[PDB]
Amino acid sequence: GDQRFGDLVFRQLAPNVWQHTSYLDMPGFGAVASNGLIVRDGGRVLVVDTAWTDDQTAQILNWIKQEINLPVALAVVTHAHQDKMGGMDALHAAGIATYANALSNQLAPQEGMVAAQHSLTFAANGWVEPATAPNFGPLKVFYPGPGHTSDNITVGIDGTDIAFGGCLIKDSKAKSLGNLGDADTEHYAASARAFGAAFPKASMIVMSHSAPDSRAAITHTARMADKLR
Numbered sequence: 001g002d003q004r005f006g007d008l009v010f011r012q013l014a015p016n017v018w019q020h021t022s023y024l025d026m027p028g029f030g031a032v033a034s035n036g037l038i039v040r041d042g043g044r045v046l047v048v049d050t051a052w053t054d055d056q057t058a059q060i061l062n063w064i065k066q067e068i069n070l071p072v073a074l075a076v077v078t079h080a081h082q083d084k085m086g087g088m089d090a091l092h093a094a095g096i097a098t099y100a101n102a103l104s105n106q107l108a109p110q111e112g113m114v115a116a117q118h119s120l121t122f123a124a125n126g127w128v129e130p131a132t133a134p135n136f137g138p139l140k141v142f143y144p145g146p147g148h149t150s151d152n153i154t155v156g157i158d159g160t161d162i163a164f165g166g167c168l169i170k171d172s173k174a175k176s177l178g179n180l181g182d183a184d185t186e187h188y189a190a191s192a193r194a195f196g197a198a199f200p201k202a203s204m205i206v207m208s209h210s211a212p213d214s215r216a217a218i219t220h221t222a223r224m225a226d227k228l229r
């Protein structure tokens, strides 16, 4: 059930959850799909990840306006790369409170990203320090450890079977682990499984560059990561 809205695709995953998809024509490799989430929490909307660009991100807000018609209370972005943080200005222009890993906001300038307004910090166990993620409601935010990037974070939705690995997790039939230029070879496998252990009740794993999968994605990604050991 893919709904086309301008150059973006929206798919309902569950009663209060949609997957937003945006495309960037990358030279030689084609038009790359990137996924985030839109979660209705009672009388407000929560956004996970921007589109690639400000224009695309503004089309997510246009879609929310038409299809939900409630204020976007906050957005959380899963690491400091264009597919996840490219549209930060569009969120700020819309007056939306924005949250990222402290380290994402630290990296954002040199990555050519605009920093989120607010910084998340994580306890030893990797769960977000609740003080830093206020009014997140059903969004459960977890730092699995260094993987796809050193600053990558994951999000589960309470009252839902859905967990989001971002660019850390690839689908169960994936060939490679993709871009590893900013990756941590050592702890990737561990981080991939820490995400799995953090959301064990999650039967639908949403990820950046594939349609939603089974938990096989996590094991498959972790198993492919174990070759980097």
Ligand SMILES: Cc1c(CP(=O)(O)O)c2ccc(N3CCCC3)cc2n(CC2CCCC2)c1=O
Pocket (backbone or CB within 6 Å): 026, 027, 029, 032, 081, 082, 083, 167, 178, 179
């Ligand atoms: C940041 C980044 C991404 C997004 P992410 O998956 O790393 O989050 C990317 C995402 C996808 C991608 N092709 C998709 C199929 C296989 C590879 C390449 C990506 N390249 C490398 C390009 C930079 C300019 C020319 C090559 C990236 O630099």
Ligand SMILES: [Zn+2]
Pocket (backbone or CB within 6 Å): 079, 080, 081, 148, 149, 167
């Ligand atoms: Zn990335």
Ligand SMILES: [Zn+2]
Pocket (backbone or CB within 6 Å): 083, 167, 208, 209
């Ligand atoms: Zn990615």
